[PDB]
Design a protein around this ligand. Structure first.
Ligand SMILES: [Ca+2]
Ligand SMILES: [K+]
Ligand SMILES: [K+]
Ligand SMILES: [K+]
Ligand SMILES: [K+]
Ligand SMILES: [K+]
Ligand SMILES: [Mg+2]
Ligand SMILES: [Mg+2]
Lengths: 403, 370
């Protein structure tokens, strides 16, 4: 039962058929040439070895034909003519079919070797050079705080050469595997038991969004059937399909399972421009990582706009110096001193409060939400000194030496 | 006489490290800073640090210098200039070998990676060469395989921008590095002679004769002006024939395909000093263009010098290309679309007299055409 698959059957048939016919034909020519021809009383003969005949048949069936060795008996020459008509067809068909079978092999098989203390995120669904490049340039962006998260792409396909180049440019922090989240064996390979999250990307430009949503819902069903407690973040194209994954037995927003519905968001950003014209642009720019970078060709209105695009949303713990301020005092402080715009606070279960009135105090260890140019800029609100150590207000000087 | 000492130096350095790795794996099977070092060395060999970006460039360039010293040693004929510089390059390659060893995820799969063999077959022989006062030619040609890193270098840099340029440079440098390598391998076997006959059966081929003979055999021309005569060189030629006929017969057509898939009507309309021009686009074909031109350029109209500039997202058929050549003085054609501002600039439409948009009157549906 050892030769299990159709391609292994075909492979072993081709190789052993070729070798047995080649060895046989070499013995046949060796007989004819060393015999000599009977018509000439065996006087016309050559003392070839078997190995010279085996070589000469390879050199002729490949059509190279050096003529360092050649047949000279009339029987050996008529055998070479018959051999040429048969074995050129064999060589020219067998060698390409061997090369095809040896070429049709998985290059991204194998398993994710979980490093001793690093986190990883599994990514699947619509994986292509366009989706991966846009994902990685936001995920690995330098304006985020430095964190060692490995990205592990899982997809049922070979990378295109553009994507394979991109994967090699991120070799230290991005890995790719052939397979599908529909197989428990592939989920084990990617080590999803101990992934930090799984991200399911959607083809936003598919011919039909319900087939795309149905596929992505089946992926979450598969991922959570394998292990219920992995955080799944999924992209959905239609709002009514979000009901189906809310009804999955093991889906829970309180663990951070999350359906980013493209239609829900798109139309809600647009509805916001009906209330406050242009707010779709303000808010959409606020949720992708970008850094400012002037050019001399840029008009002054574009330099103002582009300086604004360099800012995005961040979260930090407010320092002990904010404790028992009212929210308006904390927002004045962050802005006027730290150059940071404070929008909101996570009030201790816990609840998100946006621009709350003087009636709320900052607690100890309050998470605040900020607009700033980078995470490393927002860290001023965490390092912010006692007032004794930050009177000078040249804000680059704020640093962890607060006491 | 002495060859087995050089060969042994590569085999003992390979085998001892493999044994150490197997013992270490069995010990830790039965019985931090290293991850920071692994990821640092990984960022180096990936060209992510500037020092990496260099180190990688130096490894590449010094591998080419080492290969050229091998060509000089092969075209010619321990106190010599050539043995000295190639030893210095071998010491540098040994440092890079340890940097890859650190960067690799598995030490065992690393000790069998192709360039680890290139290192085993070169550094230890280069030490033995000065030690025995003998510049052995040996397996040094294997450094040609470092040419095969060029697609990675040009991908660690952002320069190799498109899938066809990636495929092109991969095919060309893979072919050239394998051909140069196989020529060095045959040169070793034929000039060595066969060990079964006490090295008495031998040929004094040059490297260049082997390089030529491999081209003449992989193309299947096979003149037989040169041929292998040692049993090892002949069995190598048999193995080479089974492999490299497939390479030549697939690579040369794919190179010709990539070189053929190039825009022939790119470039830009050079606006003459006082002539007018009309841009024409939409349904452009031999049928539409011939009917248009024979009315537009007709002799019953008054003589006016108007250039016609066809803009279309396609290559002309041979009938249309003939028609364009018959009107060469007053008709020009460009690949592109009026849907691109760059193509509209090429046709110079800022200072065209008019733009004519022709319609396919015989389309399957007139609303998609409109
Ligand atoms: Ca930013
Ligand atoms: K031929
Ligand atoms: K031939
Ligand atoms: K021939
Ligand atoms: K010949
Ligand atoms: K000949
Ligand atoms: Mg890793
Ligand atoms: Mg002209």
């Amino acid at each position: 039962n050892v030769l299990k698959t159709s391609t292994l059957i075909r492979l072993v048939q081709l190789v052993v058929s070729f070798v047995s016919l080649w060895l046989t034909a070499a013995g046949f020519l060796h007989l004819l040439e060393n015999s000599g021809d009977p018509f000439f009383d065996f006087g016309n003969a050559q003392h070839l070895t078997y190995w010279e005949c085996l070589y000469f048949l390879m050199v002729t069936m490949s059509t190279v034909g050096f003529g360092d060795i050649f047949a000279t008996t009339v029987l050996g020459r008529t055998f070479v003519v018959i051999f040429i008509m048969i074995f050129i067809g064999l060589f020219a068909s067998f060698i390409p079919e061997i090369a095809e079978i040896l070429g049709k092999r998985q290059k991204y098989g194998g398993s994710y070797k979980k490093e001793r203390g690093k986190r990883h995120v599994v990514v699947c669904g619509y994986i292509t050079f366009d989706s991966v490049s846009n994902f990685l340039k936001d995920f690995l962006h330098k304006d985020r705080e430095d964190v060692d998260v490995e990205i592990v792409f899982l997809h049922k396909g070979l990378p295109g050469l553009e994507l394979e180049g991109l994967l090699k440019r991120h070799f230290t922090q991005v890995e790719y595997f052939w397979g599908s989240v529909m197989d428990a064996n592939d989920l084990e390979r990617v080590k999803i038991q101990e992934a930090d999250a799984c991200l399911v990307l959607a083809n936003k430009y598919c011919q039909d969004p319900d087939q795309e949503d149905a596929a992505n819902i089946m992926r979450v069903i598969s991922i959570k059937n394998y292990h219920s407690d992995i955080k799944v973040i999924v992209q959905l194209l239609q709002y009514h399909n979000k009901a189906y994954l809310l009804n999955i037995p093991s889906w829970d927003w309180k663990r951070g399972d999350d359906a980013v519905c493209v239609a829900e968001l798109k139309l809600g950003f647009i509805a916001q421009s009906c209330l406050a014209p242009g707010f779709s642009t303000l808010m959409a720019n606020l949720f992708t990582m970008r850094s400012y970078k002037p050019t001399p060709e840029m008009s002054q209105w574009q330099t103002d706009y582009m300086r604004g695009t360099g800012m995005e949303m961040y979260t930090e713990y407010l320092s002990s110096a904010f404790n028992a301020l009212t929210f308006p005092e904390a927002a004045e402080l962050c802005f006027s001193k730290l150059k940071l715009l404070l929008l909101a606070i996570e009030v201790r279960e816990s609840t998100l409060a946006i621009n709350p009135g003087p009636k709320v105090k900052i607690e100890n260890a309050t998470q605040g939400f900020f607009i700033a140019e980078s995470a490393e800029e927002v860290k001023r609100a965490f390092y912010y000194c006692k007032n004794c150590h930050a009177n000078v207000s040249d804000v680059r000087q704020i640093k962890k030496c607060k006491c | 006489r002495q060859w087995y000492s050089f060969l042994a130096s590569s085999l003992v350095t390979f085998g001892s490290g493999l044994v150490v790795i197997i013992i270490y794996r069995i010990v830790l099977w039965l019985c931090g800073w290293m991850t920071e070092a692994k990821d640092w060395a990984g960022e180096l060999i990936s060209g992510q640090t500037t020092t990496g970006r260099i180190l990688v460039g130096l490894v590449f360039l010094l591998s080419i210098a080492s290969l050229i010293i091998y060509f000089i040693d092969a075209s010619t004929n321990s106190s010599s200039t050539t043995q000295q510089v190639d030893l210095a390059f071998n010491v540098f390659f040994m440092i890079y070998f340890f940097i890859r060893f650190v960067a690799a995820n598995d030490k065992l799969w690393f000790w069998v990676e192709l360039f680890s063999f290139v290192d085993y077959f070169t550094i230890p022989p280069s030490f033995v060469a000065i030690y025995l006062d003998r510049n052995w030619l040996g397996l040094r040609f294997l450094r040609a395989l470092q040419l095969m890193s060029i697609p990675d270098i040009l991908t660690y840099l952002n320069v190799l921008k498109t899938s066809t340029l990636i495929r092109l440079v991969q095919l060309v440098v893979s072919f050239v590095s394998l051909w140069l390598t196989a020529a060095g391998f045959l040169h070793l076997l034929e000039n060595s002679g066969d060990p079964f006959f006490d090295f008495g059966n031998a040929q004094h081929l040059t490297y260049w004769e082997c390089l030529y003979f491999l081209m003449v055999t992989m193309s299947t021309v096979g003149f037989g002006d040169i041929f292998a005569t040692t049993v090892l060189g002949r069995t190598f030629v048999v193995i080479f024939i089974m492999i490299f006929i497939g390479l030549f017969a697939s690579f040369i057509p794919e190179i010709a395909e990539i070189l053929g898939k190039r825009q022939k009507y790119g470039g830009s309309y050079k606006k003459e000093r006082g002539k007018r021009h009309v841009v024409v686009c939409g349904y452009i074909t031999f049928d539409s263009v011939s009917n248009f031109l024979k009315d537009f350029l007709h002799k019953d109209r008054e003589d006016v010098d108007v250039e016609i500039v066809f803009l279309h997202k396609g290559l002309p058929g041979l009938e249309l290309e003939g028609l364009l050549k018959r009107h060469f003085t007053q008709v020009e054609y460009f690949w592109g679309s009026v849907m691109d501002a760059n193509d509209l600039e090429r046709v110079k439409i800022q200072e065209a007299d008019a733009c004519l948009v022709l319609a396919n009157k015989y389309c399957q549906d007139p609303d998609q055409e409109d």
